[PDB]
Subunit: 220 residues, 6 copies
Amino acid sequence: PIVQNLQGQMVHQCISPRTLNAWVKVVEEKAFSPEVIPMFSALSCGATPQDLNTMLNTVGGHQAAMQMLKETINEEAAEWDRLHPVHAGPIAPGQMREPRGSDIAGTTSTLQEQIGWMTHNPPIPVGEIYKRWIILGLNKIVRMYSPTSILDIRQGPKEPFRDYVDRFYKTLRAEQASQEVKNAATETLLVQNANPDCKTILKALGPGATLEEMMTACQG
Amino acid sequence: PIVQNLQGQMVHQCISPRTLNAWVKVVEEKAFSPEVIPMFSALSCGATPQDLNTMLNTVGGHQAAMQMLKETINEEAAEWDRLHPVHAGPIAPGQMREPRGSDIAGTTSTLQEQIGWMTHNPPIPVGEIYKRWIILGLNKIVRMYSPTSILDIRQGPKEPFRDYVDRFYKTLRAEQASQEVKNAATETLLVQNANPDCKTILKALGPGATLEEMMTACQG
Amino acid sequence: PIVQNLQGQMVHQCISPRTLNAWVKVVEEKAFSPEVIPMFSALSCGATPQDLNTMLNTVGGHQAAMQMLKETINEEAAEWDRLHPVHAGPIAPGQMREPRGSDIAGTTSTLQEQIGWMTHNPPIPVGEIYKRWIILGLNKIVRMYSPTSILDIRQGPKEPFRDYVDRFYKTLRAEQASQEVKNAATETLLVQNANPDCKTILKALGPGATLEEMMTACQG
Amino acid sequence: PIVQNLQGQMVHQCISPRTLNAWVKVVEEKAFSPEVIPMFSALSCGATPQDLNTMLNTVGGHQAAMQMLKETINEEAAEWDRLHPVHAGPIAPGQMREPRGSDIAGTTSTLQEQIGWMTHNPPIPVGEIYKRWIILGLNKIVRMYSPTSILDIRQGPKEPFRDYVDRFYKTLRAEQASQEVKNAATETLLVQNANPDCKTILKALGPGATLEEMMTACQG
Amino acid sequence: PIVQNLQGQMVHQCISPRTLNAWVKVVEEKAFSPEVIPMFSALSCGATPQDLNTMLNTVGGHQAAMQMLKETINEEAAEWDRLHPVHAGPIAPGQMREPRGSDIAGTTSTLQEQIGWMTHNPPIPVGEIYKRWIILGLNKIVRMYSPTSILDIRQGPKEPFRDYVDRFYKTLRAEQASQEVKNAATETLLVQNANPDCKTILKALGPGATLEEMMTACQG
Amino acid sequence: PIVQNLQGQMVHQCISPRTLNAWVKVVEEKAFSPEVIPMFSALSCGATPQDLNTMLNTVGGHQAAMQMLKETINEEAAEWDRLHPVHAGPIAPGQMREPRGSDIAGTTSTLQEQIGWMTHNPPIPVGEIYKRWIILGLNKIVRMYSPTSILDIRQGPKEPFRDYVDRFYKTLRAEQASQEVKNAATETLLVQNANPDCKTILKALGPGATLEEMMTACQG
Ligand SMILES: CC(C)(C#Cc1ccc(-c2ccc(Cl)c3c(NS(C)(=O)=O)nn(CC(F)(F)F)c23)c([C@H](Cc2ccccc2)NC(=O)Cn2nc(C(F)(F)F)c3c2C(F)(F)[C@@H]2C[C@H]32)n1)S(C)(=O)=O
Ligand SMILES: CC(C)(C#Cc1ccc(-c2ccc(Cl)c3c(NS(C)(=O)=O)nn(CC(F)(F)F)c23)c([C@H](Cc2ccccc2)NC(=O)Cn2nc(C(F)(F)F)c3c2C(F)(F)[C@@H]2C[C@H]32)n1)S(C)(=O)=O
Ligand SMILES: CC(C)(C#Cc1ccc(-c2ccc(Cl)c3c(NS(C)(=O)=O)nn(CC(F)(F)F)c23)c([C@H](Cc2ccccc2)NC(=O)Cn2nc(C(F)(F)F)c3c2C(F)(F)[C@@H]2C[C@H]32)n1)S(C)(=O)=O
Ligand SMILES: CC(C)(C#Cc1ccc(-c2ccc(Cl)c3c(NS(C)(=O)=O)nn(CC(F)(F)F)c23)c([C@H](Cc2ccccc2)NC(=O)Cn2nc(C(F)(F)F)c3c2C(F)(F)[C@@H]2C[C@H]32)n1)S(C)(=O)=O
Ligand SMILES: CC(C)(C#Cc1ccc(-c2ccc(Cl)c3c(NS(C)(=O)=O)nn(CC(F)(F)F)c23)c([C@H](Cc2ccccc2)NC(=O)Cn2nc(C(F)(F)F)c3c2C(F)(F)[C@@H]2C[C@H]32)n1)S(C)(=O)=O
Ligand SMILES: CC(C)(C#Cc1ccc(-c2ccc(Cl)c3c(NS(C)(=O)=O)nn(CC(F)(F)F)c23)c([C@H](Cc2ccccc2)NC(=O)Cn2nc(C(F)(F)F)c3c2C(F)(F)[C@@H]2C[C@H]32)n1)S(C)(=O)=O
């Protein structure tokens, strides 16, 4: 990764074993649950495209998910070349050449070239760009590997309200969509799909009632 | 997080993997017990709004509580905006515009802005403001998810006074309350809820006795 | 905590997760045995009053012990104000204001104010003062939570001497008293409460006999 | 390893114990699965030939594979020697003689030579050259020790398409192949090996479909 | 501990949590086996008397041994005082008064005094002197708590010579002895205590044979 | 150990607890298998003779092996004195006195004297010399504690070839000898001691066939 030495110059450090293991275990333990996106984003903090590939390649199993990931990377990398045409001149001693979509993915870029792009007077972040594509690809995985649909989430007759909401938003979260789509679902289904006993209590508070006001009401 | 390098200048570092694991395991292991708020406040020492969202996003499950936490944060951001006006003047010298309540949340704010706000020569603590909002929501969650009521706590004749006293003060910690209220419950309820054999000993000690004195007297 | 950077200026660092976890586990694993006082004193090395509160607040359970702790802190904090009257003047650019008992406990002091008191040309240690009170409060807990009394410790007929002494001093240690009280007990009870077989052997060595001389004699 | 101190000069450090344990446990736990090559490449970041031999020697068992790894390394060293001639000229100024293929292996090379080669102002990467040779042998070992054949992989009617797709791409990863070959197998074999009910859905999607599209369509 | 910062000046640091856990677990796991003395000597590297007392106080249980350790330390302190006279002269310039035996123990000495003694331009090693006293007591404890006697160790005909040889040398390590005494026991007892079938082989090898030679000869 | 501070001066650091524990566990877990030599060499990286003794003394059990080790050290230390006669003059302010065999073993050398020899303008490495003897002594242990002889290694009738080779070289490795002795064994016994079915296949490839070519042929 590109960390900052005490000299204020962003230097390339080796990806710590602690970081690798943590990434391998979250994938083995938590699989592709929503909390795998934050862990990756945090464990990839300041990573070079090669550091990212390293992490992804350490993922044992889920090779299907990994292929979709490569497909999404290929997709987004094609959006980088269709929006950033290659800019061919000579080579200067001030500036780096124009990065390409494949260069960002680390396929056609070396570590030095990657490192330089991130450590540049006008910095072009190939790491954060690459990481941006990956997290999008993992959102398609979490969406896919989510068996539930928010519509299929209904409160059971003997189910505590806190549990139904935990399930409502667990499904809502995995089903990645606009915050507007996810906000409309709550105001539509959270009370509509509640069991009749608590549902009349919820209707008995008014739509402008917080989730806290809903959940404290249907306690027992 | 915004840590202080040996140069005395507050520099930004990556959230350590250890810190992530600690925050995740204290939520998995302890759930929303009162001792998770201190753990959060400690594990988020000098964290940026992006670091705080990272920790909150790593919390697998409890999505009901997490949405409640978001609602508390939204309320606090609205209050911040009403407390702090938007400013008309255009782009001033070595200065940071005032963060909006959403900027403190990091929903509308870049990490560089966050780092700049925290590292500004007259610092503005966008991360700590957000952390206060988060902690308020955590306190709401703990109180909601605490079944015990201080009035409900009572000492069985078979039960030790010290075991009952643990539960009584655990219930008082679990249920957010003003320190005076907690003292008032401690003054009146603890003896009255205690079993009569222990209670008569407590009455023998009189009002001016340490909890140690009360405990040693009922111990036998 | 207030650690020393390589610049020789005592700087405030964040309490490491390793330190927190270690404190949580010793309390969960070892509870309030005597070895919890050293672990706290060591894990609190260089801690600010807020760092201490953090640790104490992370303690899950034993809330009874925690209330006695607050009581003892309240007691000692009252001894700080009865011996250090508040000293009100203007504010200078050399020196810090006079600390108060509540300020030491972190109740009525911010981290900056705490930090400054510890990092002062004439240093006033609010951390080591606060820690001094806490360890005293934990000595009352270990004393209380010790079910045994040194008088109730007697060597069994089929009990090896090394085991009886381990129990004699295990109880002796938890029963915090003057080293003079604890020295008198040994010279009184260690041999008096030994079983008759070994007891005559001990009497057969003379009072000026080391514990080693006692324990090697009653081997088998 | 050759790490970069805060002086900007690449200095030599000892291979951390954590790094050793990680490399040993990933071989004990994962054996020679494809995910051990990335783990090796990462755990050997900036390693000297002596550090690489250290890791390889710590591998308990798999001695057949290890001897195969040695043979691959020997071949690469012979190829290096034929690529790079031995040089007649005697002992030049601030310069490093060309390493022989055995010197890159570290069999005939001192650690000081290795450190000097890597730290030379025009660096020669003796450790990275050796690491490439090692990784080639590791790839040979993984392919040999992978029982699965991409043609052998087939979807049972009972088996989920996504589970079969995992196996198919795991087998393609386990068996070293050119990326075009792997794409060719993916294009033709994946649908044909899939079970007919899923296969007819895949045929309905047509050639231009994401693996996600294929998977969601056969999912049900 | 007194560690050396990058400024070449020995600075004081806090005893790391890892170091504490290691010292506690090696006592819990290994108790007072001979291998705990090296572990202590290593875990107390460059420790102050306060750090040494911290480690000793963290030892849960074994209070008989701990009191024995205190007695050994008291004896050594008395011997130090008789070796080193108290000095009449009043308060000299950049100099440290001579520590009393109790000061080395840290019973009568402040940590600042300890740090000053160790960091004095002509250093006085109050911590290392105390550590020697502690280690002497530890050796007394190990020898007392070792049941085995080198004369008692003997090889069963069923028992392997190498297993017996392990026990023989373990017993010699467990029982503190002069190196010449241990050599004398090794020279005479090891063959004589060995079983006759192995013993006649040992006699065939003759006096001038390595323990390896003896072992390989009795091995079969 | 003697590590390099950022000032470029090799300074003596304390042996980390992580290093100790790692050495204790590899001996307890892996005993004297061949992979214990690399772990020691790596865990001893940059160690002083006292640091080495510390590690060896932490080894719980295998005291027989430990005595042979002392014997081998005594042997090699005698080769240091028979090749390096003591060189007695005065004491200078440039240079260190001539080291002795016992000084290298740490028996008759202090840490300062050891440290100085390693941190000398003309460096004389007492640590790497001592470590060189130890690893030789452990090669005699691994040889001894290896019950198998390469001659007694034969492929079973229902044994996969990969397993027989793993055993052939596992034994070959533990049986430390010249690489020439170990190379001759392979070309002699690896195919000679194969079961008849695979053996004719191996003979059917020619002696100039790699181990890979052998092992891919006898797959099934
Ligand atoms: C750092 C990177 C590491 C990141 C991130 C990042 C950036 C900004 C924010 C954010 C903060 C504060 C507010 Cl007030 C809002 C807000 N207000 S609101 C009510 O929509 O109107 N929205 N957002 C989101 C956005 F900023 F994008 F608009 C908000 C956030 C927070 C993180 C957070 C987690 C737990 C508890 C509080 C907050 N929220 C989300 O992540 C989106 N989310 N969605 C859903 C659902 F249930 F609907 F599916 C859920 C969340 C969820 F909050 F996590 C929580 C369990 C429910 N994280 S990473 C890979 O970890 O993400
Ligand atoms: C660091 C930041 C991380 C913080 C903090 C922070 C700041 C100040 C204090 C504090 C210290 C000393 C005293 Cl004497 C009082 C005192 N005396 S008083 C006015 O008469 O009641 N009050 N306070 C609290 C207040 F600051 F408000 F004054 C005191 C504290 C204390 C520290 C402390 C923990 C455990 C044992 C002793 C002390 N922790 C709490 O008190 C929390 N607690 N709550 C309850 C309730 F009531 F629920 F049962 C109980 C506790 C409890 F102590 F564990 C005990 C079993 C009862 N922590 S953070 C986000 O983690 O908070
Ligand atoms: C650092 C802070 C972290 C501390 C501390 C600190 C400061 C000084 C001393 C100390 C050292 C050497 C001597 Cl010779 C004496 C001595 N000589 S004597 C025989 O009384 O005349 N007394 N002391 C104590 C004092 F200095 F206070 F006077 C001595 C000590 C030592 C620590 C030590 C532990 C184990 C083995 C040897 C020593 N001893 C105590 O802690 C008090 N103790 N009591 C009792 C009992 F059995 F009686 F209950 C026991 C101890 C005990 F030694 F632990 C041991 C199991 C028995 N620790 S902390 C929170 O960890 O404490
Ligand atoms: C760091 C060093 C440590 C390295 C490396 C390194 C360099 C570049 C890339 C890479 C990135 C993005 C794209 Cl879009 C492609 C792409 N697209 S393409 C041309 O159409 O196929 N190819 N490559 C690979 C190549 F560089 F060759 F172009 C791509 C990579 C990728 C990173 C990556 C891992 C997982 C998920 C997404 C991405 N890892 C692999 O691909 C390995 N892999 N293999 C196979 C096969 F085929 F066996 F099934 C499969 C994978 C797999 F991705 F896991 C997935 C389930 C299929 N790693 S190291 C020694 O560890 O390697
Ligand atoms: C670092 C400080 C931390 C230290 C130390 C320190 C200093 C020097 C030495 C040492 C080195 C080499 C040789 Cl050749 C001899 C040698 N040869 S001799 C004169 O003929 O006997 N003697 N010594 C010891 C002495 F220094 F006294 F000379 C030798 C040592 C050695 C190092 C060592 C450990 C294991 C295997 C080889 C070597 N450790 C011990 O010897 C302890 N030991 N004891 C016994 C007894 F007898 F009980 F069975 C046994 C051992 C044993 F080696 F494990 C072996 C199974 C027998 N450690 S510390 C507080 O941990 O000590
Ligand atoms: C650092 C210190 C820490 C060290 C070391 C060190 C120094 C140099 C070398 C080395 C490297 C490359 C080549 Cl091509 C050859 C080569 N070519 S060859 C085919 O003989 O002609 N020989 N050597 C060895 C030597 F340089 F000494 F000549 C080679 C090595 C490598 C390490 C290595 C381990 C695993 C896989 C590849 C390599 N090999 C050995 O260690 C000796 N070995 N022996 C045997 C057997 F099976 F025969 F018993 C085996 C090995 C073994 F390779 F480990 C492997 C399981 C078989 N390690 S340490 C205490 O860890 O050792």
